[PDB]
């Protein structure tokens, strides 16, 4: 769960703000990265 | 929706050649765990629905739905109020969504390993059965 | 049926609240876990 | 959605001819990384959802969603306020 | 002046809350800060 | 005709902007100030 940053432009310049976003992907990526990591480093040691 | 894939089943379910008794349970295992593993993360394609009070404009509902689905959830039998702090509220805590659908993928993988072990090892022995089996067979 | 927890951020900080959610999955998972449990522990005893 | 392509798998997965041990791990590798590579940029066809306050007319929501998705994002554990400048926030 | 005090409330209040939060602000205390200090936290630096 | 300045507060702090306002009064005040000025400084010289 993250806090996104955001801009507009009006005569007042940067005019920025934050909106907190839910993040779905990060459940995938750190579901697989584990597995994919084991499996690669395996492929290394068996391939050396 | 409705979809059914036969050839993916028949492929491993049969094509790897052996009748070996009750070792084929490794096969049928991998099937069951594989399928259910998938069909669960299919999201019944409404993962979870929530109640939010009435002034949210429905682009928050489609948020609070997810946000509920990721950040933890919990339970209480009903009528205890909530008490306060984190203690009595979050005691009874149920989220396994972070577990089931993937840990099954891992499952099926670990039932299919031991075969791969076997073929690798029996290949180490230098004397292959499979060739013989097919040969004397036909 | 669960009571979900939820946050916002305003100048007042944590700003949290609860919303009770219906839960469909839990009807599946504890429909199958039984079956899958029998069937595994079977597969163990027949495989030993 | 739901879609499954077998022939693309069987093609390289088998048709190039060799049994060479554990060099076929180069093959099965290319399979896994290829698939996951694709299915991730599939966007689960809801890449990311965001919270925006209530007066945006929903054609901004469909904007701020993307804009969030491209311009950077970040994290803080929650309750630190944000402090200020760029330092402790980002 | 028969608008005692007016307040800013965010946008989803249906205007029968505005006519509330107006009063509620007017009775329960109010306070000040020069502006840009954030609010800090607790009751100390805010109030 | 003026350009008014304005603030909010969100997690991003000052969050300010401008909105240009029409100004009616200034037509009065600089309609009378002339007259009132003559009439005062008169009242001075006749009162000295």
């Amino acid at each position: 769960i993250v806090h996104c940053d955001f801009n507009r432009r009006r005569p007042a310049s940067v005019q920025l703000d934050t909106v907190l976003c839910v993040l779905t992907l990060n459940i995938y990526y750190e579901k697989l990265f584990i597995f994919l990591w084991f499996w690669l480093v395996f492929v290394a040691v068996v391939s050396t | 929706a409705i979809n059914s894939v036969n050839a993916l089943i028949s492929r491993v379910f049969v094509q790897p050649k052996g009748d070996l008794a009750d070792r084929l349970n490794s096969r049928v295992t991998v099937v069951i765990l594989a399928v259910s593993s998938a069909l669960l993360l299919s999201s019944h394609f409404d993962p979870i629905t929530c109640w939010t009070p009435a002034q949210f404009n429905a682009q928050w509902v489609n948020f609070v739905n997810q946000y509920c689905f990721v950040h933890g959830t919990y339970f209480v039998p009903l009528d205890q109020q909530l008490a306060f702090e984190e203690e009595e509220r979050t005691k009874v805590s149920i989220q396994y969504y972070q577990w089931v659908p993937y840990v099954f993928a891992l499952q099926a993988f670990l039932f299919y390993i031991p075969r791969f072990i076997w073929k690798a090892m029996i290949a180490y022995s230098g004397y292959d059965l499979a060739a013989a089996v097919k040969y004397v067979d036909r």
Side-chain angles (χ1 to χ4, degrees), chain A, chain B:
Chain A
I1 298 298
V2 299
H3 306 291
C4 198
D5 291 347
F6 169 64
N7 295 343
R8 298 181 193 172
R9 277 179 60 86
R10 287 198 292 278
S13 182
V14 288
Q15 184 69 263
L16 67 74
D17 41 354
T18 62
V19 181
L20 74 82
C21 301
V22 69
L23 185 58
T24 300
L25 295 172
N26 202 28
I27 195 173
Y28 296 142
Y29 285 142
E30 259 69 354
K31 281 298 181 70
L32 73 77
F33 281 154
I34 310 304
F35 164 78
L36 188 140
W37 179 81
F38 275 169
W39 189 87
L40 259 72
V41 71
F42 169 86
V43 175
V45 293
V46 64
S47 179
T48 181
Chain B
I2 300 100
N3 191 342
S4 179
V5 55
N6 185 31
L8 192 149
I9 297 302
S10 178
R11 185 174 67 87
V12 170
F13 179 81
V14 174
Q15 300 295 95
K17 300 297 184 180
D19 288 346
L20 304 174
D22 318 340
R23 297 187 180 281
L24 63 82
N25 280 339
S26 177
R27 182 193 298 262
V28 60
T29 300
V30 172
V31 169
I32 286 173
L33 267 53
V35 167
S36 295
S37 175
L39 184 143
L40 292 172
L41 71 90
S42 172
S43 299
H44 190 65
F45 293 165
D46 56 354
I48 181 174
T49 308
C50 212
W51 166 255
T52 169
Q55 66 284 8
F56 294 175
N57 65 343
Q59 284 75 356
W60 299 4
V61 177
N62 189 32
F63 174 95
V64 65
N65 211 31
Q66 273 74 354
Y67 173 81
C68 186
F69 176 81
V70 169
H71 189 281
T73 62
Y74 64 88
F75 170 77
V76 61
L78 306 177
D79 46 355
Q80 289 183 332
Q81 187 58 263
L82 301 183
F84 296 100
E85 190 67 10
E86 63 187 342
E87 183 69 12
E88 191 64 22
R89 58 165 63 205
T90 310
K91 189 192 300 177
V92 180
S93 174
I94 194 152
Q95 57 165 8
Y96 34 71
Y97 311 138
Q98 318 309 317
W99 285 276
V100 171
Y102 300 132
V103 73
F104 279 176
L106 185 68
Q107 298 298 95
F109 183 86
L110 261 63
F111 282 92
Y112 177 75
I113 290 169
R115 288 181 59 83
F116 173 84
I117 284 171
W118 167 249
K119 289 194 297 183
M121 178 175 288
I122 199 62
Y124 177 78
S125 174
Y127 163 72
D128 44 351
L129 287 182
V133 175
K134 289 185 298 299
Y135 173 75
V136 59
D137 181 69
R138 66 185 178 280

